[PDB]
UniProtKB/Swiss-Prot annotation, chain A:
Present with 91800 molecules/cell in log phase SD medium. Fatty acid synthetase catalyzes the formation of long-chain fatty acids from acetyl-CoA, malonyl-CoA and NADPH. The beta subunit contains domains for: [acyl-carrier-protein] acetyltransferase and malonyltransferase, S-acyl fatty acid synthase thioesterase, enoyl-[acyl-carrier-protein] reductase, and 3-hydroxypalmitoyl-[acyl-carrier-protein] dehydratase. Belongs to the fungal fatty acid synthetase subunit beta family. This is Fatty acid synthase subunit beta. The chain holds residues 1416 to 1486 of 2051 of the full protein. It comes from the Eukaryota. Coiled coil: none annotated. [Alpha(6)beta(6)] hexamers of two multifunctional subunits (alpha and beta).
UniProtKB/Swiss-Prot annotation, chain C:
The modification Phosphoserine is found at S38. Present with 17000 molecules/cell in log phase SD medium. 4'-phosphopantetheine is transferred from CoA to a specific serine of the Acyl carrier domain by the C-terminal PPT domain. This modification is essential for activity because fatty acids are bound in thioester linkage to the sulfhydryl of the prosthetic group. Fatty acid synthetase catalyzes the formation of long-chain fatty acids from acetyl-CoA, malonyl-CoA and NADPH. The alpha subunit contains domains for: acyl carrier protein, 3-oxoacyl-[acyl-carrier-protein] reductase, and 3-oxoacyl-[acyl-carrier-protein] synthase. This subunit coordinates the binding of the six beta subunits to the enzyme complex. [Alpha(6)beta(6)] hexamers of two multifunctional subunits (alpha and beta). This is Fatty acid synthase subunit alpha. Belongs to the thiolase-like superfamily. Fungal fatty acid synthetase subunit alpha family. The chain holds residues 921 to 968 of 1887 of the full protein.
């Protein structure tokens, strides 16, 4: 089969746990457009974060995604 | 203690420039303690020297 | 005996230890944050 226009996928990812130690980690996190905090001023230093995400992709061909959405 | 007088025994305080100068308040603390000692005696119990 | 002061005015800076530590800390912070952020951006570009 090669009708990739008809294909879609949905995976629930493993829970990822991150321990925020330094301001370097906070700077790295805040650089990511996708890391959106409800309270922009939240103090993340010395906090443990868990990310519970889901990925929904559509395929352009075997190896390349026509769209990727993680939330 | 008369004003404009340095007591024979006094304490000093360091200034932002780093030099130590006579301090009326600290010296008053020290001299008041010395007076209390001379009158009532001072204890040193529980002191390890 | 002569005493020459060639300290260039540094004696007037208050709390020199803290001031220099602050200066150095701000410089290392800038450097490390920039380096790590650039590395992460490079990895995300390469994976995307």
């Amino acid at each position: 089969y090669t009708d990739f226009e008809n294909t879609f996928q949905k995976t629930v990812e493993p829970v990822y746990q991150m321990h925020i130690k330094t301001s370097k980690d906070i700077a790295v996190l805040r650089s990511k457009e996708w890391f959106q905090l409800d309270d922009e001023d939240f103090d993340l230093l010395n906090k443990t974060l868990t990310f519970e995400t889901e990925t929904e992709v559509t395929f352009k061909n075997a190896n390349i995604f026509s769209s990727v959405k993680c939330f | 203690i008369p004003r404009e007088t340095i007591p024979f025994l006094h304490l000093r305080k360091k200034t932002p420039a780093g030099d130590w100068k006579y301090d009326r308040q600290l010296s008053s603390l020290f001299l008041d303690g010395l007076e209390k000692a001379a009158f009532n005696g001072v204890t040193f119990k529980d002191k390890y020297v | 005996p002569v005493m020459a002061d060639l300290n260039g005015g540094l004696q007037f800076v208050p709390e020199l230890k803290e001031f220099t530590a602050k200066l150095r800390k701000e410089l290392v912070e800038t450097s490390e944050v920039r380096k790590a952020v650039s590395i992460e951006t490079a990895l995300e570009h390469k994976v995307v």
